[PDB]
Curated annotation (Swiss-Prot):
Record organism: Ixodes scapularis (Black-legged tick)
Induction: Strongly up-regulated in salivary gland during blood-feeding on the host. Peak expression is detected 48 hours after feeding begins.
Expressing tissues: Detected in salivary gland and midgut.
Disulfides per UniProt: 71-84, 95-193, 102-124
CDD domains for the chain: M28_QC_like
Disruption phenotype: RNAi-mediated knockdown results in reduced enzymatic activity in midgut and salivary gland tissue extracts. Weight gain after feeding is reduced. Females lay very small eggs which fail to hatch into larvae.
One Pfam family of this chain: Peptidase_M28
Protein's name in the database: Glutaminyl-peptide cyclotransferase
Positions annotated with a glycan in the UniProt record: 32, 263
């Protein structure tokens, strides 16, 4: 009951695949094409928000993923609002899901039009970019019958309408967590669960949720925010280290290394889309910088303040991480 091992043995990415995940050569224009669709105000209930959702759904339906639009109405300080989570699953029958998540709504800012380029246009784009860039390998992985799949969740209504409170925020995530907790299931209904796993409902199928937010500014610092997922987090540290050793990271000068993923833990908690899951025992890795970028919730969280080299470096880490976890 001390030092419980991660339930899935984590096999290090082959040098071959590392070197391959780590050259985002000319991908580059493809990522930016994706991102431009998100660099618009995406306020809840707005037309542009509707359109971003349609772009997400279609991008993933086109890659033959199972896509569910989980729409519902909820009460806010601004009245009743329609919300719509997007849940995409590569192989719906697989018992276990590696879940990558972000929110696609943008903050309603008092002072003017807010783009939320790091929050979370970039993360949204990174999830679609991972799905597209790894499609070939994911489609092959899907037919192994090994009981693991990739699942992407684009939450709606993360942002508070007024002052952040338990009542005013995380509308999409609170809704989804409860729903999946109440929707009962078991191993016998599913494809190839791990041997002595305890599945009683849909939320138990989330093996780990990796939540991305506030990405795209220069030089983020990440820490392990949860002891529970330290074995998963350590894989990001190791991947980043291997990418630097292979000289595959974009840096301003030679003889520099990236050090985004600190090999320490931090004493800090961040009120976010992972919480209602945390209460239901879903292990969480929160990929969010500490401290937040300086542009956080300002009108300067915009396209021009994004840092291309950092974004391409993060993309390499994430592609390598998904490849290693799913053994692509
Ligand atoms: Zn003890
Ligand atoms: Zn629902
Ligand atoms: Zn925000
Ligand atoms: Zn956010
Ligand atoms: Zn957090």
């Amino acid at each position: 009951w001390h030092d419980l091992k991660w339930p899935r043995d984590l096999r290090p990415l082959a040098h071959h695949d590392l070197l391959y995940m780590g050259q985002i050569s000319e991908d580059r224009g493809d990522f930016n094409a994706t991102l431009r669709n998100f660099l618009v105000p995406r306020v809840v209930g707005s037309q542009k928000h509707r359109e971003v959702r349609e772009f997400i759904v279609r991008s993933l339906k086109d890659l033959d993923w199972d896509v569910e639009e989980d729409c519902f109405d909820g009460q806010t300080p601004h009245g009743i609002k329609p919300f719509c989570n997007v849940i995409a699953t590569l192989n719906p029958s697989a018992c276990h899901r590696l879940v990558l998540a972000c929110h696609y709504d943008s903050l309603l800012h008092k002072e003017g039009t807010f783009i939320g380029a790091t929050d979370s246009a970039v993360p949204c784009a990174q999830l679609l970019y991972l799905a597209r860039s790894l499609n070939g390998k994911l489609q092959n992985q899907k037919t192994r019958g090994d009981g693991l799949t990739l699942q992407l969740v684009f939450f709606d209504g993360e942002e508070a309408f007024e002052r952040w409170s338990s009542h005013d925020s995380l509308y999409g995530s609170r809704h989804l967590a409860q729903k999946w907790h109440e929707d009962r299931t078991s191993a016998e209904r599913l494809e190839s669960c791990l041997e002595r796993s305890e599945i009683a409902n849909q939320i138990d199928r989330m093996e780990v949720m990796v939540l991305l937010d506030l990405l795209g500014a220069e030089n983020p610092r990440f820490y392990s925010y949860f002891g529970e997922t330290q074995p998963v987090y350590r894989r990001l540290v190791n991947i980043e280290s291997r990418l630097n050793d292979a000289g595959l990271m974009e840096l301003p000068r030679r003889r520099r290394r990236t050090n985004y993923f600190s090999n320490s833990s931090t004493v800090g908690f961040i009120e976010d889309d992972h919480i209602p899951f945390l209460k239901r025992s879903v292990p969480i890795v929160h990929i969010i910088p500490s401290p937040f970028p300086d542009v956080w919730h300002t009108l300067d969280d915009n396209e021009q303040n994004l840092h291309h080299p950092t974004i391409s470096n993060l993309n390499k880490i994430f592609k390598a991480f998904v490849s290693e976890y799913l053994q692509l």
